[PDB]
Subunit: 207 residues, 4 copies
Amino acid sequence: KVEQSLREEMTRIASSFFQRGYATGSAGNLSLLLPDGNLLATPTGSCLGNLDPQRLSKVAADGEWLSGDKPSAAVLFHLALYRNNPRCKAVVHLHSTWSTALSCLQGLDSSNVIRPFTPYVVMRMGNVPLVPYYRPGDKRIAQDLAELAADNQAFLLANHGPVVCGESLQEAANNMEELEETAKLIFILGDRPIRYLTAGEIAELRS
Amino acid sequence: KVEQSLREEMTRIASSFFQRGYATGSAGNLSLLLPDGNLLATPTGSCLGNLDPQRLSKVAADGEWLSGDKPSAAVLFHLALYRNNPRCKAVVHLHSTWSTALSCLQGLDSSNVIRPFTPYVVMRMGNVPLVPYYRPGDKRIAQDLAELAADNQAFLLANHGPVVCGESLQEAANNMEELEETAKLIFILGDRPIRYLTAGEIAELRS
Amino acid sequence: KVEQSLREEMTRIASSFFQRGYATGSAGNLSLLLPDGNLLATPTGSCLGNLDPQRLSKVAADGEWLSGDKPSAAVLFHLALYRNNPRCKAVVHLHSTWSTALSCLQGLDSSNVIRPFTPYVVMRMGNVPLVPYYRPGDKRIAQDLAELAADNQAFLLANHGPVVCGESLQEAANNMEELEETAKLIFILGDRPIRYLTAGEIAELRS
Amino acid sequence: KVEQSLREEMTRIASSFFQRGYATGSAGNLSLLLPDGNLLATPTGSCLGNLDPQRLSKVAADGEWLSGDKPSAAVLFHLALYRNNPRCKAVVHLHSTWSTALSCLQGLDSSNVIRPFTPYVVMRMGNVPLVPYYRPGDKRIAQDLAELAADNQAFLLANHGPVVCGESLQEAANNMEELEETAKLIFILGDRPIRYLTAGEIAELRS
């Protein structure tokens, strides 16, 4: 069954994030779009490193909890991204160290939080806009993500972490990994004179 | 048997801490409360990455070593936390890098060692008070933890590391992971202008 | 079959890089030389942590895709290294954090990007020249690597990462690991007074 | 057979060091003392993450290679430690990142390279003297380690890394892990005002 292999892929990818330090405790959740249009999401209060595939949540496009354990409360803004971007087929939301660290900085650019010095995040994602800080579970987190969903596939929630989309769970996972990697390079480079990509070198990647 | 699954869960969670770098050598110990009220703790001189479930220590509420290998000497303050907080059902004590690093700083706040810039540690734990430095195994470590046990679920022992409680071993592990994560962000952010959560944003999380 | 064990070794080594944080997402590719002279390379759009051995790409010396999935676009400069260094039997290309970080610095030395303070990179690789930044997939990346292939076994592509060769896949992997380790020490040491190896201590290692 | 379980323990411990980032490539070697007095050491050109237990080297006290693959060239100073400390039963030598980083600093103390701010390295090892930098394989590395072997169980080789002993392989591994952890805290704390252990707090640990 295709749904069974999708549940195992989510379990497998979730465990990978947990063992490699991307996921911290019960902080985070993943979701993908099944062929029929329904959602497959990690349940609430679930450690990403030991997920039960047959207990993964199943939510309809309108938000109706269909089967599996209770979905995570963060699924509310997962649905906002699917409803405003037809090319979004999977959402990866983690509180990875360096992306969450970047999101806690004053004077960030809410249109694109990283200035590119490597070509990969511009090629895969482009602009990473900043979502304002709200209490976890706030209505305005999902409402803001719905405004930016049509023309962005990655987002940085302030004092929270990144939220990355993709046309497949593997793609959204890889995109999340390159975003967290780029934020990690920002802090590593620090005050050193970085050779940023010039405006012309950026335009060659937007194609 | 429920006790068998609790022993395996402790072995499993311990190995996770070891493979992901939270536990260093034989430095650390875990304990949980069994349904009958007795304790299940990791034994002394035991590497958390290769625990034998059927050799885990079993200690009564009064401190009597019942079965299994010799319990860790740190179990003495584990019992202090259970005797002064009825909601404490598991204790996780590790010398994780960034929490232990934070505990070695001068001018720390002994009422709450971290100023929140992310909402999660305030939501799950609240205040992380500082326990003074003593020789490992000192009577005063357990005596101090008994004073703060009633109204705190996490503690930072100076020049030592963190000690986190929970209503379940999974909860105490997740809480430990978010505390160590927050101390890791402190050193990563460094002297950068951090956007701390304002007093009003903190009060919305204490509910 | 020898080819089967070479496919498994590539799968095994690739997974090791992925689980230990050297490989990030789909960023990277490995290749080795089979006894008959043909290439065995990781395919495009493939996560290094879950490679299928029987789907690894097979490319002839002239660049003809023979079997397996579509090879990575980076294979183009893999072939440039084999065609200009008969002792190169395997190529490891990853975007590891600290090597990629070093490659983003202004004022680097394009003849040797690291000044030795440990003896190991000088013993195994020697000089690590800098390849200019181009758009990923540019013809000039392979053309430049062909110029430096005869007398170098490691290369640092600016705003990109390292590219390391070896007389075996294990050797090229070990060389990559010591290069990334040395770049990691550079940023860790920072502005501290480092005791660099003197010119005489370097000459004793070039033998 | 006891020797078989010792070979598996060495293989198991070696893999743990490799997967957790302590060992980098083929850089490093482990050895322990068998009951009969002979040595069990990791062979040369061997990746610590995939050791064959039945191919581990076997060396007599006088240095005669008895069985298994060719022992590592670093075994020469392993034997120097056993011949000058009867309580040394295992030697762990790795080029771990932060210990190797510390060993590259000018103005180190050759009597004890770390000033204690945590009690654990003083309790387990005590003084960590500095061994001068020589070409890898130099006679003077083993000769210097033989001078300090009688009254020290850990050593820091300049521009090289740590070398830790123990009364068992598990003990030497745990000691190595706490030494590398302490060097990691040194760089993390940096220029921050550290609350070092006072002279009186150190004397309570030397007992």
